[PDB]
């Protein structure tokens, strides 16, 4: 603005003068040197630049998640075997824990030396400790006890646990290095050396079959039956001479589950891989020959740069972006702003508004006259290069008419009327008529026509549709397709006897208005097609475009935007012609107005030629590098039937309606915000325009387009789009497990109990999934939050617009697969068989006293101790359980489910909820009979965490103190772990002692048991179990090929893993441009 | 795929003023009413109109 | 033994969809929003905007 | 007050603000005034 300065600063300090103000001081010294955070802010920053995730991360430790922990120490110094038998005496270090009872637990990434940890981890203590806290994290926010969990949320907690178990293992197996075995333990094998401080302890863990075999202990019994020649490395790709062979295959300890997960992850990354040749082709095609980039031509070293993605992912990302933008006008305006900024940086056009002054100063008009058209237009136009950013914002709004709609401000209209006798209003009409065709507002033609109609009322007349939108109504109010007057669509209602000039202006609008076109930007080979309604790689434009024939441009008057001005000036000439419309004017004034109009129709301006020849080329060169890709709809030229009246996006279904094509009509939210502009500024920029003295456009663009293509940042947004699609698919696949959704999901964990989830439960679970996926991948901004503000268990994505005809166009993008959801499903399918290793047990428990000296394990009880529904003499309870006190010696009675009442003895069957609802009334009545009486109850649970207690078999033991503190702690909201008493195994005979069990299982849950008395020759008393050979198939079965895996029912704990040595350099380190 | 701009099958005079008895010109009297895409094979043309509006 | 109510009532469950236009009050909200939309659509009733 | 104390329903006006994010949106926000928390 016209600022001034006042008072304070005075220091010239080059010539020791004192000034009037610090601003004047700054201008003075410059002359010397020259001569001689709201959510809206979050969304804005989101659009302008997102957070790129961490896709490639390497792992140098052995790829496993299951470890073996000793639970009971061996009885090494004993009086049956001399200590010289065992290998412990000789300090021989074995691959397996040398204890009396081993067992498998789960500690994700326990042997791993990673590049970048993902903060997710499923760590489990041994079963002797308490693991109840792994199942009370998500929705268990009101369980008073510390060691208590709510059984109706085991499924949700287990689903979250499996998602963590997958996210923790999204690493690449890294290639470290090898050395040869200088000992005779193997026939000269190559043994991987993994980095770390203490590395000697790993060569006995990775390679079970290197140990000597001196004993008949169980470890040596196992090792002596394995294959000799499956150790270390057995294959490699050595493509270059001494350059770190690309990949290798090695036998070593690792489990099939995490090996399969990492294989899937690598197979997903290998599909996005692009090479330097394709990158340079794509960049050259995007820049359209102005910028050249070179790639090498030699044998490569196997780079890995995942940057290519399908079109569905980009379309889904674009839908989510528009869903964020909708109806704000501050989230979208910065994009137009910085687009205008780089248009200013790149464009060769330069608006100098002295052409208008120099052409208007040559007008010949008298001085004894109270009107002057030259001075009038100079005042109305005010040529000043202060703010011609309106021109650039208009040019940038062409890329966005689905969300943004640029409209001329109503401060540009003639202030409540305006008549044809007023010179100010005539020039206002001229300015608006030139400025309107450069806006993406569909109602610009009618706003122009009714500008003229308002401006001449009382001179001519036309019939309007009603009495509200009359002819004197403000022209800027006709802003919808419904509002266009019938006399503008039926020309013969503007009869030339009454409204000749108005009919002429109507015909001019219909015939000579600018025509749309397109420019075909981008290259969808490496990138995709973000656009949703136009075909891929096309860019619609409100004006015609035909390229240039020469690189040294010179003036010409042979284009559409100059013919429009010629027609407008011709009609204004006709309008000023008659004395009917300006009865008071004189011949001198009429001639001067003619002179000004005829001199304004041919004004040597380069702006129309620019808009025809070079502006679309610049828009197409700028588009592929934009952070927010263009989002257009068709530019209907003048037809009313085809104007778009809405564009809306859906993010959830509506009813019992599974199909998006049917649920999309009435479950969308409209999107779009208008931006006002300045007709004065646009018309000044459109009249004043000139090139540099002798520009050569090829050189100009060749050295003005280089930096924005040397800046490689659009490649890092495709990865963000990948992560967005992966997250939405994972959300769908996981919410379908606890709720009832529309997708054909698979279901494995229905046997674990769970509550009846409502909208709040589903939203909470979705929030947990969102945070857990943001913690990995190192994200900070929003991701999956646009989908969480509704009902997450009916989600679906789709967009559409509608015309004035009511004909709708929709775009339902197809959901591509997601490796993360596939791996979560695989982990669930494996959990279904290996649930014991994660601490869960199946079936239910049978509370009843059993006293005997036998050594069977409660996690694998004998058959004639369990009973079920279809057993003779069993009572099932649950629907209305009533107790009736006994009187005069008669025993109390409880009510069967079928109306019978029975005493406190026999075999019963309770629902766990039935016990929880009466946890206290039942303890006092029943506990005295379970302890010493003959009562037995089968509390049916389905799934429950357990805990183990080992005891010496040759001493009296009793379980009541454990099994009473559980029954009296069952609660209407929580249950603690189920305590079992397991005996210890003994490699030599012992004396027996009575035990008193109270809790036992109804199935086989003793599956995490690895080995018992692993260092002794035998196991003579107690549960024995040799090393599981089926876990080590490729090592004990010579006929099995080395790459076999039996996934759903065995984890296999040892197999061939492949290790890579790829390298991930930046783009600019491989694809160099030529300056 | 050669692209030529069709033009002006007809031509208008001064005394032609939108009369009910004047001959219709079918919009072929002004500059640009359509574009012609010539090629050698309709397969090539059909493939051209995949990336064209 | 009757308690009159000015609205319909159905058996209870928490696992029922939020957007359920079988519900009377949800249907009423949807219908009112649809009519106000139809009122605002053409700008026939809002000159001066 | 008895219904308020035995009902499961919770009423937080923050849902309207989270869904919203002359500006008709701000107009209805100011006209509903979700910051008030008297639902007697
Ligand atoms: Zn000075």
CB A826 within 8 A of CB A800: no
Token pair of A566 as six digits: 């010629």
3-state secondary structure of A995: strand
Measured in residues, chain A has a length of: 1075
d(CA A150, CA A918): 16
Separation of CA A36 and ligand 1 centre (Å)? 12
Which residues of A are annotated binding-site positions for Zn(2+)?
12, 14-15, 28, 32
* Interface touch A540/B53, C-beta < 8 Å: yes
With 0-12 CB in 10 A as exposed, 13-18 as middle and 19+ as buried, what is A723?
buried
C12 touches chain A (CB under 8 A): no
* Interface touch A511/B53, C-beta < 8 Å: no
CB A524 within 8 A of CB A718: no
* Interface touch B50/A511, C-beta < 8 Å: no
* Interface touch C44/A468, C-beta < 8 Å: yes
* Residue to substitute from A482, A648, A672, interface C, most C β-carbons within 10 A: A482
A646 touches chain C (CB under 8 A): no
Nearest to A534 among B18, B32, B53 (CB): B53
A114 Rama class: left (phi>0) / alpha (psi -120 to 50) / beta:
beta
Residue D21: its chain A contacts at CB < 8 A? 39-40, 43, 328
Token pair of A645 as six digits: 């009246």
Q: CB neighbours (10 Å) of residue A502?
A: 22
Separation of CA A340 and ligand 1 centre (Å)? 37
Residue B22: its chain A contacts at CB < 8 A? none
- Angle CA(A285)–CA(A290)–CA(A291) in degrees, nearest 5? 75
CB A1008 within 8 A of CB A105: yes
Token pair of A128 as six digits: 């002797």
Separation of CA A25 and ligand 1 centre (Å)? 8
- CA distance to partner chain B, nearest, from residue A803 (Å): 18
The separation between CA A409 and the C-alpha centre of its own chain, rounded to angstroms, equals: 38
Which whole-number Å values give the CA distances from A654 to A320, A667, A814, in the listed order?
19, 6, 19
d(CA A393, CA A410): 17
With 0-12 CB in 10 A as exposed, 13-18 as middle and 19+ as buried, what is A78?
middle
Does an H or E element contain A426, and which?
Answer: helix A423-435
Strands laid side by side in the A874-876 sheet? A874-876, A906-911, A935-940
- CA distance to partner chain A, nearest, from residue B32 (Å): 9
Residue A667: its chain C contacts at CB < 8 A? 19
Does an H or E element contain A1011, and which?
Answer: strand A1009-1012
Q: What is the DSSP string of A644-713?
A: EEEEEEE-S--SS---HHHHSTTS-EE--EEEEE-HHHHHHHHH--B--TT--HHHHHHHHSHHHHHS--
* Interface touch A327/D25, C-beta < 8 Å: yes
d(CA A390, CA A683): 10
Separation of CA A19 and ligand 1 centre (Å)? 9
- CA distance to partner chain C, nearest, from residue A501 (Å): 27
Residue of A nearest to B49 (CA): A535
Nearest to B53 among A511, A538, A544 (CB): A538
Of the candidates A407, A406, A456, the residue with the CA atom closest to the CA atom of residue A428: A456
C10 touches chain A (CB under 8 A): no
Of the candidates A171, A219, A200, A210, the residue with the CA atom closest to the CA atom of residue A64: A171
Residue with tokens 């109503």: A410
**Euclidean distance between the first and the last CA atom of chain C, given in angstroms as a whole number:** 57
3-state secondary structure of A1072: strand
For A209-216, which contacts have Cβ atoms below 8 Å and span 24 or more sequence positions?
A209/A1035, A210/A181, A210/A185, A210/A186, A211/A92, A211/A94, A211/A95, A211/A185, A212/A92, A212/A185, A214/A87, A215/A85, A215/A86, A215/A87, A215/A1017, A216/A1017
Interacting residues of A758 by C-beta distance below 8 A, sequence separation 6+? C14, C15
A585 Rama class: left (phi>0) / alpha (psi -120 to 50) / beta:
beta
Residue A540: its chain B contacts at CB < 8 A? 53
Residue A511: its chain B contacts at CB < 8 A? 30
A-B contacts at Cβ under 8 angstroms = 20
CB burial string A889-901: b at 16+ within 10 A, e below: eeeebbbbeeeee
Q: What is the DSSP string of B2-40?
A: EEEE---SS---SS----TTSPP-TTTTSS-S-EEEE-S
- CA distance to partner chain A, nearest, from residue C40 (Å): 11
Any chains having at least 3 CB pairs less than 8 A from chain D are A
Residue with tokens 């179990």: A1025
Interacting residues of A277 by C-beta distance below 8 A, sequence separation 6+? A295
3-state secondary structure of A737: helix
Residue A534: its chain B contacts at CB < 8 A? 53
Residue A538: its chain B contacts at CB < 8 A? 51-53
Which whole-number Å values give the CA distances from B19 to A418, A492, B8, B24, in the listed order?
33, 11, 20, 9
3-state secondary structure of A22: helix
Nearest to C18 among A469, A477, A759 (CB): A759
Does an H or E element contain A727, and which?
Answer: helix A715-738
d(CA A416, CA A476): 10
For chain D, after which residues does the C atom lie more than 2.5 Å from the next written residue's N, i.e. where is it broken? 21
With 0-12 CB in 10 A as exposed, 13-18 as middle and 19+ as buried, what is A1070?
middle
Token pair of A804 as six digits: 């004035």
C43 touches chain A (CB under 8 A): yes
Any chains having at least 3 CB pairs less than 8 A from chain B are A
- CA distance to partner chain D, nearest, from residue A760 (Å): 11
* Interface touch B32/A515, C-beta < 8 Å: yes
Scanning A937-998, the segments in alpha helix (DSSP H) are 960-967
CB burial string A255-292: b at 16+ within 10 A, e below: bbbbbbbbebbbebbeebebebeebbbbbbbbbbebbe
d(CA A185, CA A229): 11
3-state secondary structure of A749: coil
Separation of CA A384 and ligand 1 centre (Å)? 29
d(CA C28, CA C30): 5
The separation between CA A724 and the C-alpha centre of its own chain, rounded to angstroms, equals: 2
d(CA A633, CA A400): 8
Of the candidates A319, A725, A323, the residue with the CA atom closest to the CA atom of residue A533: A319
A-C contacts at Cβ under 8 angstroms = 47
**In this complex, does chain D touch chain A, defined as having at least 3 beta-carbon pairs under 8 Å apart?**
yes
A-D contacts at Cβ under 8 angstroms = 7
With 0-12 CB in 10 A as exposed, 13-18 as middle and 19+ as buried, what is A393?
buried
- Angle CA(A941)–CA(A944)–CA(A948) in degrees, nearest 5? 130
d(CA A835, CA A944): 11
Measured in residues, chain D has a length of: 40
Residue of B nearest to A533 (CA): B53
* Residue to substitute from A535, A616, A636, interface B, most B β-carbons within 10 A: A535
Which residues of A are annotated binding-site positions?
12, 14-15, 28, 32
* Interface touch C19/A758, C-beta < 8 Å: no
Residue A327: its chain D contacts at CB < 8 A? 25
Residue A479: its chain C contacts at CB < 8 A? 43, 49
Residue with tokens 């409100």: A542
3-state secondary structure of A12: coil
Any chains having at least 3 CB pairs less than 8 A from chain A are B, C, D
Of the candidates A739, A732, A737, the residue with the CA atom closest to the CA atom of residue A761: A739
Residue A72, beta-bridge partner list: A101
Residue of A nearest to B35 (CA): A517
Q: CB neighbours (10 Å) of residue A200?
A: 7
Nearest to A538 among B18, B30, B51 (CB): B51
For A1021-1026, which contacts have Cβ atoms below 8 Å and span 24 or more sequence positions?
A1021/A855, A1021/A953, A1021/A985, A1021/A986, A1021/A988, A1021/A989, A1021/A990, A1022/A855, A1022/A953, A1022/A983, A1022/A984, A1022/A985, A1022/A986, A1023/A855, A1023/A856, A1023/A857, A1023/A860, A1023/A982, A1023/A983, A1023/A985, A1024/A985, A1026/A218, A1026/A221, A1026/A222
D19 touches chain A (CB under 8 A): yes
CB A448 within 8 A of CB A509: yes
Residue A906, beta-bridge partner list: A935
**Structure solved via:** cryo-EM
């Amino acid at each position: 603005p016209p600022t001034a300065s006042s008072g304070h600063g005075y220091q010239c300090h080059v010539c020791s003068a004192v000034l009037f103000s610090p601003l004047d001081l700054d201008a003075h010294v410059a002359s010397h040197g020259l001569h001689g955070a709201d959510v809206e802010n979050r969304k804005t920053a989101q659009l302008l630049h997102a957070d790129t995730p961490r896709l490639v991360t390497w792992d140098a430790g052995l790829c496993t998640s299951f470890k073996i922990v000793p639970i009971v120490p061996a009885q090494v110094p004993q009086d049956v075997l001399a200590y010289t038998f065992f290998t412990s005496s000789y300090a021989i270090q074995s691959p397996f824990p040398e204890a009396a009872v081993s067992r498998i637990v789960v500690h994700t990434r326990w042997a791993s030396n990673v590049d970048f940890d993902r903060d997710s981890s499923v760590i489990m203590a041994p079963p002797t400790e308490n693991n109840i806290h792994l199942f009370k994290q998500l929705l268990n926010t009101e369980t008073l006890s510390v060691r208590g969990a709510n059984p109706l949320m085991f499924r949700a907690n287990v689903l979250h646990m499996l998602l963590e178990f997958v996210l923790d293992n999204l690493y690449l197996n890294r290639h470290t290095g090898f050395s040869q075995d200088h000992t005779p333990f193997t026939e000269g094998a190559n043994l991987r050396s993994l980095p770390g401080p203490d590395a000697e302890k790993w060569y006995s863990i990775m390679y079970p079959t290197r140990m000597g075999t001196p004993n008949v202990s169980k470890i040596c019994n196992f090792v002596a039956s394995c294959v000799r020649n499956r150790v270390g490395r057995f294959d490699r790709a050595q493509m270059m001479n001494g350059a770190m062979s690309e990949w290798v295959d090695v036998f070593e300890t690792s489990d099939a589950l995490t090996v399969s997960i990492r294989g899937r992850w690598m197979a997903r990354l290998a599909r996005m891989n692009i090479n330097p040749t394709e990158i340079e082709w794509a960049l050259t095609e995007c820049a359209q020959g102005y910028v050249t980039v070179t790639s090498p031509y030699a044998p490569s070293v196997n780079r890995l740069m995942p940057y290519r993605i399908s079109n569905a992912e980009r379309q889904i990302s674009q839908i989510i972006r528009v869903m964020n933008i909708g109806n704000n006008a501050t989230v979208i305006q910065p994009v137009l702003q910085d687009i205008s900024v780089l248009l200013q940086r790149i464009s060769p056009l330069q608006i100098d508004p002295t052409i208008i002054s120099n052409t208007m100063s040559t007008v010949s008009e008298s001085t004894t006259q109270t009107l002057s058209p030259a001075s009038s237009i100079l005042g109305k136009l005010r040529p000043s290069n202060s703010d011609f950013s309106s021109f650039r914002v208009a040019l940038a709004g062409w890329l966005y008419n689905g969300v943004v709609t640029t409209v001329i401000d109503d401060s540009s209209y003639p202030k409540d009327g305006g008549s044809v006798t007023s010179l100010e209003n005539l020039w206002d009409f001229f300015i608006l008529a030139l400025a309107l065709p450069l806006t993406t507002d569909p109602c610009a033609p009618v706003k122009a026509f009714m500008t003229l109609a308002n401006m001449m009322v009382g001179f001519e007349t036309i019939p309007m549709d009603n009495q509200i939108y009359t002819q004197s109504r403000r022209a800027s109010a006709f802003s919808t397709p419904h509002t266009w007057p019938r006399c503008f669509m039926n020309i013969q209602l503007i009869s030339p006897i009454d409204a000749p000039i108005l009919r002429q202006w109507a015909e001019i609008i219909h015939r000579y208005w600018p025509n749309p076109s397109q420019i075909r930007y981008g290259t969808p080979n490496v990138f995709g097609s973000a656009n949703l309604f136009t075909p891929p790689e096309v860019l619609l434009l409100p004006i015609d475009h035909q390229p240039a024939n020469v690189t040294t441009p010179t003036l010409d008057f042979t284009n559409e935007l100059t013919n429009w001005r010629a027609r407008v000036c011709e009609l204004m000439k006709n309008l000023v012609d008659n004395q009917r419309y300006q009865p008071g004017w004189t011949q001198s004034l009429v001639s001067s107005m003619r002179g000004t109009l005829g001199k304004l129709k041919l004004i040597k301006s380069m702006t129309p030629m620019y808009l025809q020849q070079l502006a679309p080329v610049e828009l197409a060169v700028i588009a592929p590098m934009l952070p927010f890709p263009p989002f257009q709809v068709p530019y209907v030229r003048l037809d009313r039937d085809r104007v778009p009246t809405m564009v809306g996006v859906t993010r959830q279904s509506r009813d019992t309606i599974t199909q998006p094509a049917l649920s999309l009509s009435t479950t969308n939210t409209t999107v779009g915000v208008p931006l006002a502009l300045d007709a004065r500024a646009i018309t000044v920029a459109l009249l004043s325009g000139k090139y540099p003295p002798d520009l050569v456009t090829n050189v100009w663009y060749a050295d003005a387009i280089y930096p924005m293509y040397a800046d490689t940042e659009v490649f890092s947004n495709l990865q963000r789009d990948v992560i967005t699609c992966e997250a939405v698919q994972t959300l769908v696949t996981l919410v379908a497990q606890i709720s009832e959704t529309q997708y054909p999901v698979d279901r494995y964990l229905d046997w674990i109990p769970s509550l009846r989830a409502s909208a709040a439960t589903a939203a909470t679970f979705a929030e947990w999934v969102n945070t857990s996926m943001k913690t990995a991948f190192d994200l900070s901004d929003m991701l999956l939050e646009p989908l969480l503000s509704g009902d997450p268990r009916m989600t679906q994505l789709a967009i559409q617009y509608q015309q004035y005809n009511g004909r709708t166009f929709n775009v339902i993008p197809e959901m591509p697969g997601s490796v993360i959801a596939d791996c979560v499903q695989l982990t669930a399918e494996v959990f279904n068989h290996e649930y014991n290793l994660f601490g869960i047990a199946r079936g239910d428990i049978i509370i009843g006293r059993v006293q005997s000296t036998h050594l069977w394990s409660p996690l694998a009880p004998p058959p004639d101790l369990v009973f079920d529904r279809d057993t003779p003499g069993v009572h099932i309870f649950g629907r209305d359980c009533r107790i009736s006190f006994g009187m005069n010696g008669a025993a109390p009675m409880i009510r069967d489910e079928t109306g019978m009442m029975v005493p406190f003895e026999g075999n019963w069957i309770f629902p766990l909820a039935l016990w929880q609802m009466n946890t206290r009334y039942f303890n006092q009545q029943f506990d005295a009979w379970i302890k010493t009486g003959e009562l037995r109850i089968r509390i049916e649970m389905g799934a429950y965490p357990y805990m183990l207690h080992y005891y010496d078999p040759r001493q009296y033991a009793n379980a009541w103190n454990l099994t009473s503190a559980w029954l009296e702690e069952i609660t209407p909201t929580s249950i603690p772990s189920v305590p079992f008493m397991v005996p210890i195994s003994s490699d030599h005979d012992i004396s027996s002692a009575p035990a008193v069990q109270y809790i036992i299982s109804t199935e086989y849950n003793d599956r995490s048991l690895f080995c018992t008395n692993s260092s002794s020759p035998q196991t003579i008393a107690g549960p024995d179990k040799h090393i599981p050979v089926e876990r080590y198939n490729i090592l004990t079965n010579p006929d099995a090929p080395p790459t076999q895996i039996q996934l759903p029912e065995v984890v296999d704990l040892y197999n061939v893993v492949t290790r890579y040595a790829y390298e991930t350099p930046p783009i600019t380190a491989v694809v160099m441009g030529v300056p | 795929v050669l692209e030529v701009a069709a033009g002006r099958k007809y031509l208008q005079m001064n005394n032609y003023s939108n009369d009910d008895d004047d001959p219709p010109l079918f919009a072929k009297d002004l500059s640009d009413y359509a574009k012609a895409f010539y090629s050698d094979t309709y397969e090539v043309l059909d493939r051209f109109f995949w990336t064209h509006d």
